[PDB]
Amino acid sequence: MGGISIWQLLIIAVIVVLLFGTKKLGSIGSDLGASIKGFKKAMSDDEP
Prior knowledge:
By secondary structure, the protein is mainly alpha-helical. The protein has helices spanning about 5-20, 25-45.
């Protein structure tokens, strides 16, 4: 924090994605991204 929010993430995410080779996110994000969707989806409901 202290200046890091979406902008830093954007540059970082872009660099990370090209530099990583778009292999990890696709390999880990598959279980990880999915886990959060299930998590967020589970808590997304029953909330204002």
